[PDB]
């Protein structure tokens, strides 16, 4: 459950991502696949080689959905209902994998935006991604 300040921190930090959405999205995925290789088995038909155009294209989808989630932070279950169909009903993704991707996003954000990655903003982003993760892994229809 996000406080008003959490929403303030998330909106302000993710807005600083901007045109670097797909770049940071792709970088998170590559960290995740490499730090935690078991995650690759959710993408068995993917080209997961370093720098592959498919992972770029997929990282951009992640970040754009996160952008969408930031704007609909007070309407998550409705705004994310289709992504929950995919991850919870079809892919039945284990929730520990969401912690891994969320951590890798935080790492990416800290590597690229050191001035904005303050303790308070770090804490808000973690809860925001945990909140998005809960929605994507729960079957609510």
């Amino acid at each position: 459950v996000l406080s008003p300040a959490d929403k303030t921190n998330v909106k302000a930090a993710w807005g600083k991502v901007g045109a670097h959405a797909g770049e940071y999205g792709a970088e998170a995925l590559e960290r995740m696949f490499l730090s935690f290789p078991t995650t690759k088995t959710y993408f068995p038909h993917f080209d997961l080689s370093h720098g592959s155009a498919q992972v770029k294209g997929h990282g951009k989808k992640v970040a754009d959905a996160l952008t969408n989630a930031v704007a609909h932070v007070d309407d998550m279950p409705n705004a994310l209902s289709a992504l929950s169909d995919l991850h919870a009903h079809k892919l039945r993704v284990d929730p520990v994998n969401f912690k891994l991707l969320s951590h890798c996003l935080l790492v990416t954000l800290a590597a690229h935006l050191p001035a904005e990655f303050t303790p308070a903003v770090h804490a808000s982003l973690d809860k925001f991604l945990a909140s998005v993760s809960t929605v994507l892994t729960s079957k609510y229809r």
Binding site: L34, V107, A110, A111, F117, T118
Partner: protein, 146 residues
């Protein structure tokens, strides 16, 4: 106890550049801020009511330096993480009863702090090698539960 020779090289080289006077307090401080329930274990440390109070609490920064030294001890003994931490494992598991999921959290907070201070130099390969360090430290610290 599970690192390839190239992963040991990468973690040793990066750690030689780590400011062991500031990185520990930064990581313990962020643990207390991002995961607020962990403040319960540090009730004698004084003011922890806001992010600024936590990150400026001199007891947090002093104790974080002890944390980081013990992480340094583990990095010089990478193939004997169980023994390096055995006594801390008794304290954290048998005396303090810190649930081991908290060991994973601090390890990953530390990973975020390393990324924060190194930027582009904390590359996906450097991160992956460090992910096995902090997971081995968490596992070792939880040994007395095992």
């Amino acid at each position: 106890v599970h690192l390839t020779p190239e992963e040991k090289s990468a973690v040793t080289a990066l750690w030689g550049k780590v400011n062991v006077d500031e990185v520990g307090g930064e990581a313990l401080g962020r643990l207390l801020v991002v995961y607020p329930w962990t403040q319960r274990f540090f009730e004698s440390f004084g003011d922890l009511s806001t992010p600024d109070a936590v990150m400026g609490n001199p007891k947090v920064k002093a104790h974080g330096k002890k944390v980081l030294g013990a992480f340094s001890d583990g990095l010089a003994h990478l193939d004997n993480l169980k023994g390096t931490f055995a006594t801390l494992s008794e304290l954290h598991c048998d005396k303090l009863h810190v649930d081991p999921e908290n060991f994973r959290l601090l390890g990953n907070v530390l990973v975020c702090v390393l990324a924060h201070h190194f930027g582009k130099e904390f590359t996906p390969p450097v991160q992956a090698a460090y992910q096995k360090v902090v997971a081995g430290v968490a596992n070792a610290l939880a040994h007395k539960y095992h």
